[PDB]
């Protein structure tokens, strides 16, 4: 029986929202019910902090990172990314990190 009272995800009063298409497995899932991260990530990377501003003009430069929002599909979300699978109490903690 009900093993969730926010149901699938977050949908009380609206009654219909639109499919966001999971980026890895290409499913359709209700925008709300998505599960979403933000891809804040410095365009260059780890080892490259040196090799950059060194063989580069300007002073230090500034460094201009890139953002993309990733919508996952459960079926996807489970597999790789943020999901784990929780016990019957921690399935409560909506809290982030």
């Amino acid at each position: 029986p009900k093993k969730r009272a926010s149901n699938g995800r977050n949908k009380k009063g609206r009654g219909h929202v639109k499919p966001v298409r999971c980026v890895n497995c290409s499913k359709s899932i209700p925008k709300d019910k998505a599960i979403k991260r933000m891809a804040i990530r410095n365009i260059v990377e780890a080892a490259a902090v040196r090799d950059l501003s060194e063989a580069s003009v300007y002073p230090e430069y500034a460094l201009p990172k890139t953002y993309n929002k990733l919508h996952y599909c459960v079926s996807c979300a489970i597999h790789a990314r943020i999901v784990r699978v929780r016990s019957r109490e921690d399935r409560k903690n909506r809290a982030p990190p």
């Binding site: 365009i43 300007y58 500034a62 201009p64 990172k65 890139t66 953002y67």
Partner: protein, 214 residues
């Protein structure tokens, strides 16, 4: 068997007047033969780069601009305006959750009869001391703000062609008179003209085209 580099006519680019440096980058034609000549075959091409790459200071880290090349005068070729962009890493920086967003737009003309399309953007600034984590907009506050944005955006152009609008936003005088009337409705942060694009140009007119040269 060819390797065209033992054949390619070679140029540098020249910018115009309402900025900083005029001399630019480098390029590749082909020998100015009879039939398939290096003059009227190309040149017209366009080139983009951020404007701190021609305003020198990094109090201008984004704002890209396409320059249309127009004229030629012996292995040199000038350019004139063809639209301004921005940068993702700032757009995306500035397009941030827990807040509203506004953008309006206008089509219009100028003294020299280029018609173009300009845009804008600004964001609900969380005003210092606001307990509430969202600083929200009231629609009726957005539409009137679109209106005002529209009030200003169509009295700023038709002022002496591109050149005068050009030099009307390089220091973003607009960005504040926007923010001027704006303080009377709500907060707001960022407040930038984002993009702008040309599409219906008049004739070459090669006498008032050469204005920004020397």
């Amino acid at each position: 068997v060819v390797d065209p580099f033992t054949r390619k006519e070679w140029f540098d680019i020249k910018a115009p007047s309402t900025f900083e440096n005029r001399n630019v980058g480098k390029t590749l034609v082909n020998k100015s033969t009879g039939l398939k000549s290096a003059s009227d075959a190309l040149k017209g091409r366009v080139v983009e780069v951020c404007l701190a790459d021609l305003q020198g200071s990094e109090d201008h880290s984004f704002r890209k601009i396409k320059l249309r090349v127009d004229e030629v005068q012996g292995k040199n070729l000038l350019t004139n305006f063809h639209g301004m962009d921005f940068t993702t890493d700032k757009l995306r920086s500035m397009v941030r959750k827990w807040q509203t967003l506004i953008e309006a737009n206008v089509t219009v003309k100028t003294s020299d009869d280029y018609v173009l399309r300009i845009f804008a953007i600004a964001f609900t600034r969380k005003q210092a001391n606001q307990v509430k984590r969202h600083s929200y907009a009231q629609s009726s506050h957005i539409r009137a703000i679109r209106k005002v944005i529209s009030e200003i955006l169509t009295k700023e152009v038709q002022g002496s062609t591109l050149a005068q609008l050009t030099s009307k936003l390089i220091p973003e005088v607009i960005n504040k008179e926007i923010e001027n009337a704006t303080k009377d409705i709500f907060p707001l942060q960022n407040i930038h003209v984002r993009k702008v694009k040309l599409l219906k140009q008049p004739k070459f007119d090669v006498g008032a085209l050469m204005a920004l040269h020397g």
